Motif scaffolding. Structure first.
Motif, PDB file in Angstrom:
ATOM      1  N   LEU A  74      16.172  20.730  16.829  1.00  0.00           N
ATOM      2  CA  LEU A  74      15.138  19.918  16.420  1.00  0.00           C
ATOM      3  C   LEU A  74      15.185  18.717  16.946  1.00  0.00           C
ATOM      4  CD1 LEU A  74      15.139  20.556  12.414  1.00  0.00           C
ATOM      5  CD2 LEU A  74      13.577  21.480  14.333  1.00  0.00           C
ATOM      6  N   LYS A  75      16.407  18.390  17.437  1.00  0.00           N
ATOM      7  CA  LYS A  75      16.616  17.032  18.265  1.00  0.00           C
ATOM      8  C   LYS A  75      15.766  17.048  19.436  1.00  0.00           C
ATOM      9  CE  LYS A  75      21.203  16.738  15.891  1.00  0.00           C
ATOM     10  NZ  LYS A  75      22.604  16.819  15.914  1.00  0.00           N
ATOM     11  N   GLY A  76      15.139  16.043  19.733  1.00  0.00           N
ATOM     12  CA  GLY A  76      14.306  15.863  21.145  1.00  0.00           C
ATOM     13  C   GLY A  76      12.799  16.511  20.813  1.00  0.00           C
ATOM     14  N   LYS A  77      12.633  17.177  19.777  1.00  0.00           N
ATOM     15  CA  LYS A  77      11.312  17.669  19.371  1.00  0.00           C
ATOM     16  C   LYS A  77      10.677  16.787  18.326  1.00  0.00           C
ATOM     17  CE  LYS A  77      11.446  22.228  19.319  1.00  0.00           C
ATOM     18  NZ  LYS A  77       9.904  21.701  18.964  1.00  0.00           N
ATOM     19  N   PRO A  78       9.310  16.319  18.347  1.00  0.00           N
ATOM     20  CA  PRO A  78       8.889  15.460  17.156  1.00  0.00           C
ATOM     21  C   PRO A  78       8.917  16.440  15.656  1.00  0.00           C
ATOM     22  CG  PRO A  78       7.460  15.474  18.935  1.00  0.00           C
ATOM     23  CD  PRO A  78       8.344  16.676  19.241  1.00  0.00           C
ATOM     24  N   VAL A  79       9.322  15.638  14.660  1.00  0.00           N
ATOM     25  CA  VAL A  79       9.445  16.262  13.473  1.00  0.00           C
ATOM     26  C   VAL A  79       8.858  15.734  12.183  1.00  0.00           C
ATOM     27  CG1 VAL A  79      11.214  17.259  11.832  1.00  0.00           C
ATOM     28  CG2 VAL A  79      11.904  17.393  14.193  1.00  0.00           C
ATOM     29  N   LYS A  90      -1.591  17.249  11.655  1.00  0.00           N
ATOM     30  CA  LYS A  90      -1.646  18.394  12.758  1.00  0.00           C
ATOM     31  C   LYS A  90      -2.622  18.228  13.747  1.00  0.00           C
ATOM     32  CE  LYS A  90      -0.126  22.132   9.662  1.00  0.00           C
ATOM     33  NZ  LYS A  90       0.788  22.916  10.576  1.00  0.00           N
ATOM     34  N   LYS A  91      -3.747  17.381  13.391  1.00  0.00           N
ATOM     35  CA  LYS A  91      -4.884  16.970  14.351  1.00  0.00           C
ATOM     36  C   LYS A  91      -3.952  16.524  15.598  1.00  0.00           C
ATOM     37  CE  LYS A  91      -7.693  14.529  11.952  1.00  0.00           C
ATOM     38  NZ  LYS A  91      -9.170  13.750  11.840  1.00  0.00           N
ATOM     39  N   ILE A  92      -3.088  15.326  15.229  1.00  0.00           N
ATOM     40  CA  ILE A  92      -2.682  14.679  16.160  1.00  0.00           C
ATOM     41  C   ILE A  92      -1.386  15.539  16.956  1.00  0.00           C
ATOM     42  CG2 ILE A  92      -1.192  12.788  16.636  1.00  0.00           C
ATOM     43  CD1 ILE A  92      -2.580  11.392  14.123  1.00  0.00           C
ATOM     44  N   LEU A  93      -0.377  16.131  16.096  1.00  0.00           N
ATOM     45  CA  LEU A  93       0.557  16.717  16.702  1.00  0.00           C
ATOM     46  C   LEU A  93       0.743  18.286  16.081  1.00  0.00           C
ATOM     47  CD1 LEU A  93       3.558  14.484  16.608  1.00  0.00           C
ATOM     48  CD2 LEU A  93       2.305  15.300  18.563  1.00  0.00           C
ATOM     49  N   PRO A  94      -0.627  18.942  16.700  1.00  0.00           N
ATOM     50  CA  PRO A  94      -0.653  20.313  16.243  1.00  0.00           C
ATOM     51  C   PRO A  94       0.573  21.133  16.429  1.00  0.00           C
ATOM     52  CG  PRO A  94      -1.787  19.907  18.157  1.00  0.00           C
ATOM     53  CD  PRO A  94      -1.662  18.601  17.520  1.00  0.00           C
ATOM     54  N   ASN A  95       1.399  20.801  17.525  1.00  0.00           N
ATOM     55  CA  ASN A  95       2.579  21.397  17.702  1.00  0.00           C
ATOM     56  C   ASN A  95       3.863  20.577  17.549  1.00  0.00           C
ATOM     57  OD1 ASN A  95       1.510  23.772  19.545  1.00  0.00           O
ATOM     58  ND2 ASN A  95       0.330  22.069  20.240  1.00  0.00           N
ATOM     59  N   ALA A  96       3.888  19.599  16.545  1.00  0.00           N
ATOM     60  CA  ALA A  96       5.263  19.302  16.248  1.00  0.00           C
ATOM     61  C   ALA A  96       5.789  20.240  15.218  1.00  0.00           C
ATOM     62  CB  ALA A  96       4.969  17.951  15.280  1.00  0.00           C
ATOM     63  N   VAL A  97       7.153  20.075  14.732  1.00  0.00           N
ATOM     64  CA  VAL A  97       7.675  20.909  13.969  1.00  0.00           C
ATOM     65  C   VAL A  97       7.617  20.263  12.661  1.00  0.00           C
ATOM     66  CG1 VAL A  97       9.962  21.689  13.333  1.00  0.00           C
ATOM     67  CG2 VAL A  97       9.538  21.561  15.461  1.00  0.00           C
TER      68      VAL A  97
END
Ligand SMILES: Nc1ccn([C@H]2C[C@H](O)[C@@H](COP(=O)(O)OP(=O)(O)OP(=O)(O)O)O2)c(=O)n1
Ligand SMILES: [Mg+2]
Ligand SMILES: [Mg+2]
Ligand SMILES: [Mg+2]
Length: 341
Positions: free
Chosen positions: A23-28, A65-72
């Motif tokens: 998860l490190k490095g990816k928005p969570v 989700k609208k903002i970061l539809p691809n965040a974890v």
DNA sequence: GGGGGAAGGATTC
DNA sequence: CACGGAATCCTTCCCCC
């Protein structure tokens, strides 16, 4: 008097990372799903990647989700966080006897007896950041100053992963600078009531007539903000004791029907009473969040302790009271126990 | 006047 | 038109000493 304040970093989020380095490095984003809808709920926190783009604590999981539809997006595993928290609180107790656990991720230590000056307090801080970093691998921010309020302020200014001392001179300057809205205990409505009075800095508080501040923002906030500006705020570091224990849940659908609502109420009592542990309460309050996120409650204090059975019975009468006196539907329902024997 | 209760209010994690 | 779960301290109104 010297106060050292510690505040873990994007804590819930950081913990999930320490348990899963991928998860490190990816928005969570850690969220609490109400179970209402597949993505119904609010955000506990998000790490700094996701934070950058507006994803903050408290907003809907849907806005995020609208903002970061691809965040974890991860469901909040609170028992895990409390576990990690207690292990770090234990490491802190080693550095000072006077310690106050203010919340799941923060504490105030009075290090007056462990250090001679600000330079020493500072290294104690670095010593503490390292211990936690090697024992648990969690980064934290430390702020140092003369009282509890400025210690907190300092840590906010140093986040993330920092350390900051605010000495007596630096304090005088903060009373003059620093937006009053950045003072602990000052939210949006209070900050607005102060703007209408032309108060932007703590110093400005000395200029208004006391009764004009008392009338506008209550006497507590008045005195509090006053002594702060006068550099006379001195509140001891004390061990906190739980005053209340509760549980609230979102129902699958809004309602005003007693028989539909009881099961949720009972689950909340069942779980609250387990949290009580040894504690026996003398007061009980049934709390409800209306369909328009409005919150209402009805409670009762007894001459003696309240056994689980009694709570079931009393809670139903209290719920009926809410239903009777309020016309709207209920979205969330629960209970709160207090006045422990 | 102020303690204890009972509903709200505001803030914070 | 969304929308979590806890806790704590404070303020306004009421009973009662
Ligand atoms: N509205 C909130 C705020 C916080 N928390 C929980 C999860 C947070 O991780 C933890 C600590 O909250 P803080 O905002 O005080 O600290 P964070 O780590 O979230 O942010 P920071 O970078 O300031 O340390 O409390 C929560 O459930 N709901
Ligand atoms: Mg915090
Ligand atoms: Mg934190
Ligand atoms: Mg209300």
């Amino acid at each position: 008097m010297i106060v050292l304040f510690v505040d873990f970093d994007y804590f819930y989020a950081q913990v999930e990372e320490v348990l899963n380095p991928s998860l490190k490095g990816k928005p969570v984003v850690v969220c609490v799903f109400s179970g209402r809808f597949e993505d119904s709920g609010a955000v506990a926190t998000a790490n700094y990647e996701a934070r950058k783009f507006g994803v903050k604590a408290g907003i809907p999981i849907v806005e995020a989700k609208k903002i970061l539809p691809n965040a974890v997006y991860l469901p909040m595993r609170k028992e895990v966080y409390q576990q990690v928290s207690s292990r770090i609180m234990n490491l802190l107790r080693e550095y000072s006897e006077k310690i106050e656990i203010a919340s799941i991720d923060e504490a105030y230590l009075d290090i007056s007896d462990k250090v001679r000056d600000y330079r020493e307090a500072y290294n104690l801080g670095l010593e503490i950041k390292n211990k936690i970093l090697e024992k648990e691998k969690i980064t934290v921010t430390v702020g140092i100053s003369k009282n509890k309020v400025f210690a907190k302020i300092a840590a906010d200014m140093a986040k993330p992963n920092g350390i900051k001392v605010i000495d007596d001179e630096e304090v005088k300057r903060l009373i003059r600078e620093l937006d009053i809205a950045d003072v602990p205990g000052i939210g949006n409505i209070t900050a607005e009531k102060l703007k209408k009075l032309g108060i932007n800095k703590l110093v400005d508080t000395l200029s208004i007539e006391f009764d004009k501040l008392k009338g506008m923002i209550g006497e507590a906030k008045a005195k509090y903000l006053i002594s702060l500006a006068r550099d006379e705020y001195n509140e001891p570091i004390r061990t906190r004791v739980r005053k209340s224990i509760g549980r609230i849940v979102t129902m699958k659908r809004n309602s005003r029907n007693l028989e539909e609502i009881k099961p949720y109420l009972f689950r909340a009592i069942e779980e609250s009473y387990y949290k009580l542990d040894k504690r026996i309460p003398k007061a009980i309050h049934v709390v409800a969040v209306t369909e328009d996120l409005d919150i209402v409650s009805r409670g009762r204090t007894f001459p003696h302790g309240i056994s689980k059975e009694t709570a079931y019975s009393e809670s139903v009468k209290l719920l009926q009271k809410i239903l009777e006196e309020d016309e709207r539907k209920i979205r969330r329902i629960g209970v709160r126990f207090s006045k422990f024997i």
